[PDB]
From Swiss-Prot, chain B:
It holds the Pfam family Ligase_CoA. SMART domains: CoA_binding. Its cofactor is Mg(2+). It catalyses: oxaloacetate + acetyl-CoA + ADP + phosphate = citrate + ATP + CoA. Citrate binds at G308, N345, T347, Y363, R378. One of its GO terms (cellular component) is extracellular region. SUPFAM superfamilies: Citrate synthase, Glutathione synthetase ATP-binding domain-like, NAD(P)-binding Rossmann-fold domains, Succinyl-CoA synthetase domains. In the N-terminal section; belongs to the succinate/malate CoA ligase beta subunit family. It comes from the Eukaryota. Disulfide bonds: none annotated. This is ATP-citrate synthase.
Amino acid sequence: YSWARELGLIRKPASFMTSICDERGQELIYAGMPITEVFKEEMGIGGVLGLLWFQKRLPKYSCQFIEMCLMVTADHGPAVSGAHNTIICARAGKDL
Amino acid sequence: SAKAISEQTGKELLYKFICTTSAIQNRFKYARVTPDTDWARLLQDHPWLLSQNLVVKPDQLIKRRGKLGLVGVNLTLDGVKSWLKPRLGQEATVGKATGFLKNFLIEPFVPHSQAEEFYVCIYATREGDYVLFHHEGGVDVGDVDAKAQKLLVGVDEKLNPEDIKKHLLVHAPEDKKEILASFISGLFNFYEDLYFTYLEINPLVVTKDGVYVLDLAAKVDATADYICKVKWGDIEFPPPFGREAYPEEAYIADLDAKSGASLKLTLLNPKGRIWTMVAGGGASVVYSDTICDLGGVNELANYGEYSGAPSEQQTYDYAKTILSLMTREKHPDGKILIIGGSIANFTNVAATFKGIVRAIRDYQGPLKEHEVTIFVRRGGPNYQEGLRVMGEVGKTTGIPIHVFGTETHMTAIVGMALGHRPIPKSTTLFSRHTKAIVWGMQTRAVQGMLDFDYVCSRDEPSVAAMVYPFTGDHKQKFYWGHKEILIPVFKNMADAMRKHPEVDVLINFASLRSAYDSTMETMNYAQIRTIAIIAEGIPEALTRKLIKKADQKGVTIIGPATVGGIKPGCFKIGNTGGMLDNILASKLYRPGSVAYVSRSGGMSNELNNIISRTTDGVYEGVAIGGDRYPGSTFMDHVLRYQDTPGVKMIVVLGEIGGTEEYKICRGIKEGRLTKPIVCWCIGTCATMFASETAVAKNQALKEAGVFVPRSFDELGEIIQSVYEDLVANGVIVPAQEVPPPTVPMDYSWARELGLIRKPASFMTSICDERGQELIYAGMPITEVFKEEMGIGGVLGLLWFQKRLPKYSCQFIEMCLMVTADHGPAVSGAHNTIICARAGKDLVSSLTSGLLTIGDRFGGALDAAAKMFSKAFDSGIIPMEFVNKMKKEGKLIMGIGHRVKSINNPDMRVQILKDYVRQHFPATPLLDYALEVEKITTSKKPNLILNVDGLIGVAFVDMLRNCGSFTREEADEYIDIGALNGIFVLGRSMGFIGHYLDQKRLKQGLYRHPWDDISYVLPE
Amino acid sequence: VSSLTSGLLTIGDRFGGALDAAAKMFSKAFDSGIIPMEFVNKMKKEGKLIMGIGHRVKSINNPDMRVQILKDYVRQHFPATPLLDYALEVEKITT
Ligand SMILES: CC(C)(COP(=O)(O)OP(=O)(O)OC[C@H]1O[C@@H](n2cnc3c(N)ncnc32)[C@H](O)[C@@H]1OP(=O)(O)O)[C@@H](O)C(=O)NCCC(=O)NCCS
Ligand SMILES: Nc1ncnc2c1ncn2[C@@H]1O[C@H](COP(=O)(O)OP(=O)(O)O)[C@@H](O)[C@H]1O
Ligand SMILES: O=P([O-])(O)O
Ligand SMILES: [Mg+2]
C-alpha cells in the first residue's frame, strides 16, 4: 500500500480531517503561522489560543484579554464542586 | 405493473367502498366454491343460498364465459351442485389456454329484461381516464370502442355529472338517467381512490328495485400497494388462465418474492435441448429472439433471467434448478446451456459466477452424462477474472465450456452453440458546463460522475450540491482525480437552490415513496430544466401528474425507472455507464457522431459497446425508463437528435408493445426526420406465447426507410455500414484520438482483487463482530446462552479467553455482588454523588468516582493478592512473614477491620470463605492467609482477614488451581491487574446506583462548608 | 481505570445512546396513542429516523441472533409486552 500510494496508483480517502496544527513539516505550524513566528511576533498564551481555537491572528488587546480571563478563572478555593473532587482524589492517592 | 384482480376481490372492494345515492342491491351476496369446499360450512355462512334461485360461474380470469356455456343461470342450490358435478376439477381449453376449472362464484339470480342491461367501463391512458357507456349491454356488446359513448377525464380532472347526463347517457331510458349518473359518478371516484387502471361492468343491471353489478373485470396498479394496503387488504393477483406452475417454477417465484433481486423462470419445453441462464430482462429477450431466429424455437426449454445483484447463494439456488431440470432425460444430440448477459454496471462479475461455478461442480456427473456444452458471454467489473473461473471449472470437471467477453457480439454465442458459425421542449439538455443537484445520499453515484468529468477533461465537477433531509447541512469529501474536494449537502432543497443558481439539472434518487413529492417540489424552482427520476415503482397515476406539471412548466423528465443517460465529454446521469473502466473501454470520455435511445438500461450499456466498436462513438445516449408512461418518449429524443448538428446518425432500440416506434415512420414520411435512423425492436419471439408486435413494427420501419437489421446479431454490422457510408460521403470527419487523464484505483477495489496488501495497525483476540454471529473468544453468542454461562462465564471468555468451571463462574459473580456497594462515605461514591449533584450525566458522574479507585481506595484486593503470593511463593512461614513486615515497617494488606473481630465475623468474608472451601479443589494461599490471620488476631482481635484480602487470595487460588491456566498465565493475569478489574466492574454498579439515587432525590448543588476547611496560606 | 474511563467517556450520544433513545421514542409514540403507521409517517415528516430500527447487514431473511435470543426470552417469561408488540408492528412497516 505504502508503495502503490507513492507511485500514485491507488487512492484511499482519509478518515480524519484537521485544520489547527501541522507537525509534519521542517517546522511546527499552528494554524498557518510557524512556531518561530509565534515567538518572534510575541503572541503569548492568548495569541496561541487564538490560532489553535479560532485559527486566527487576534489583535493584541484580544490576546491580553483572553490571558486576563484565564487568570481570574484560575482558582476560587477548595469548597467548589470540582476542587473538592480533585482534593478527594489526590487524597485517595491518585496521580495528577 | 397493472395487475388483474378476481371478480370477487373487485366486487368486495366495490361493495365496501363505493359512495352513491343509488341503492346497490345484493351487497356482499356471493359465495366462493373450490374442489375443497365444505358445503355444510358454506351453507352455515351463506343461508341466503336457499332463499332464492342462483347463478354460478368460474372466477379464473376466463373471458366470454356465457358464450362458452360456463354460466349456469336461474338454478336452485341442488341445480348448482348438479351443474358443478361435471365442471369443477375438469380441464378446459379456452382458445390457446388449457387449465383446470378450480374456482367458481355463486350469486343470487337477478330477474331482468335485456333492456335493463347496460355496459360501463373506465380505463387509464397517458392523457387521462376514458369513461365508456352503452345502453345495449350484455354478452352481445360487440366492438364497444366504436359503438359506446365515451368521455376523457384528464389528468387531475373531475368528472362533472352534467357531462355524464349530456354526453354519456344520450340513449339511456329517461327514467333511469338520474340513478345511472349517480352510480357512474360514484364508480369513477371509487376507480380513482383505489388506484384502478381498468374497470368494466358488463352487464350493469338497473331495474325498478335498484342497481346490480352482475359482472366485474378490473386491474389495479399493484405499485400503489404502499398507499392502498389499508383498503385493499391481502389482495391476491391471479395468474392468467392456463396450466399451473411446475414445482421448479414455484421455487424460483418464492426466491424472487423474498429478495430485492429479480429471479424469473418459465418452462417452455421441459424436453428441449436449449437452456438459457441470462442476466438481465433486456438481454434475456434478445437471446430468446436469436434462438428462435436460428430455428431453435421448438428446442428452447425455458424463458428466464436473474438481475438486481443476487447473492452467490441465490445465483447457486437459481443455477442448481436449471441444471437439475436439464439432467432429467438424455437427448441424442446432447444439450446446450447459454450463460449470457450484457455488460454489468458495478457488480464484480467474479461474485455471481462463483455461485454458478459451485452448481456446475455439484452437477458435473449428470452434465457429462447428458453431453452438456456451456457457452458464456459476460462483461462488467473484473469480467476477465470471472471468465477465468468459468474456464477453469471446465478443465477440472471435463465439461466443455466456451468463455467469451465484451469483444464478442452478445448474441454470437447462439450461432456458435447451434453450430452455424465456428468457435474462435429544449433541444440541448447537457453541456460541458452543466451543474446538477443530487437528491439523496448517493456517494458512489456522485463520485462516479466526478470521475467521468475528470476523465472528460471538464474544468469543473458536474455535481454542485446534494439534498439529504435527515442530516443537517454539512460538506462531503470527494475526489477530483487524486485531489480531495468538498461538496455541500443540504437538509432543505430551498437552501441548495438559493446557494446554487447555476444548477439546471436535478438527479432524483428519492425512493418510490418520496419520488413524487420531491419531483413536484423541484418544479417550484424555475432554474431546474431537466429532472432525472431513477426510482422504479412509482404508481402510474402519479407519474401522469408529474408529466402534466413538467409539460406545462417546460421541464424535461428523463425517467422514471431509468439509469439515465450519457453525453460523452459533457455529462453522465448518476450511474449510467458504470465504473471508469467501462467508460474508458467504450471510449465514453470523448464524443462521436452516433446518438441512441433505448427503454432498457442494460441494453444502453451494450449499445455503448456496439457503437464504440463499429463507429467513431456515442454523441449522446438516453434510457427512457421502463415505466408505462415515460416522462420523455422515443420521439421526444429522436427529434432532439434530429435538431442537434453534432448528431450524424440515430440508433433506436425498440420493444414489443406500444406504437411509439410508428411516430418515427410518420416523422420520416412528413420529412421532419432526414438523418439516417437504425432501428431494431426486441421481442420478435413473444408472438410464440397486432400492430404492437416487434415483427410488425420492424416491417413498417424498414418500409419507411429506416435501416433495419435481419436480427439483433446484424445490428453491429448495419451500424458499421451506415457509418462507413457517411464517412465516404464526408458527412463524418472523425477526429484524431487524444489519451484521457489517468485516475488512481480505489483502495477498496484493489483490496477486493487482492492487488495490494496493507498491514493491520491493531491486534485483537477477545471478540469478533464481523461474522454472521457475534463471537466471544471463540464461542458464538448462541452457544453462550445455550450453555448457560452467565455473567461469570462471559467474563471468563472476555477477560481470560477461557471456558471456566461453573464454580469459578459462580465465584466471580459472588465477588461482583459483595463489591457492588459499601455506602456513600467512601471516596469514589462521594465524588459520584458530588458530580451527580452538580448536574452531570451518568457517564461523567460514574467516571468521576471510578477515577479515585486505585491506591488508598479499591487497591487492597490487588495489593493483598500480590503481597501474600510473594510471601507464600518465597517459602517463608506465616510467622516469619508477620515479623518481616513489622521490621520493614509495613502493615499487612487485607488484614484488619474497624468493628469486626474474631468473635464477631464479617458476613461478606463468611459467605465467600464458605463457598470457596466447599467448591474449590485446593486453596493453598487462602490456607496460608488464614494462618497469618491466626497470628494477627492473637495480637488485636479486630486484625481479621477482611473482604479485600479474602477476594485477593481466593482469586489467586481460583486462577492457579481451577485448571484452566498455566502458572505463567495465572501470574500474568494478577500482574496486569485482573483483580483491579473485578473491583472496578463490581463497584461500578454501586456508583450508578448512587447517581440514579441523587437524581431521583432531586439533590441540589454541593458546596463544601468553610468550617471544615483549614486555610493555611502564606503571608 | 484510566483506559476504561477513556473509552466510557465516548458513550452517550452517537455511541451507546440508542438504547435510551429507542425506549424514549417508542414510549412517547405508544403513550401518545398514535398507531404504528401514523408514527412511521410522523417521523418521516419531522425528518427523524427511528431509533432502534436498522442494521448494516442483518435483514428480515437473515436475523440478528442477539435479537432472536432476547425476543424469545421476553415472549416466554414476560406476562405482558405491549410496547414490544407496538415496536414489532413498526418493524413490519419499515422492513
Ligand atoms: C498498649 C496500648 C496503648 C496499645 O495497644 P494496641 O492498640 O493493641 O497496639 P497497637 O496499636 O500497637 O497494635 C497491635 C499490633 O497490631 C499490629 N497491626 C495493626 N494493624 C495491622 C495490620 N493491618 N497488619 C499487620 N499488623 C497490624 C501493629 O503493628 C501492632 O504490632 P505490635 O504489637 O507487634 O507492635 C493499649 O493496649 C492499652 O491502652 N493498653 C492498656 C494497658 C493498661 O492497662 N495500662 C495501665 C493503666 S492501669
Ligand atoms: N346473477 C345474475 N342474474 C341474472 N343474470 C345474470 C347473472 N349473472 C350473470 N347473468 C347473465 O349472464 C351473462 C353472462 O355472465 P357474465 O358475468 O357477463 O360473463 P361473461 O361476460 O364473461 O360471459 C350476463 O351477460 C347476464 O345476462
Ligand atoms: O433489465 P434492464 O435490461 O432494463 O436493465
Ligand atoms: Mg360479461
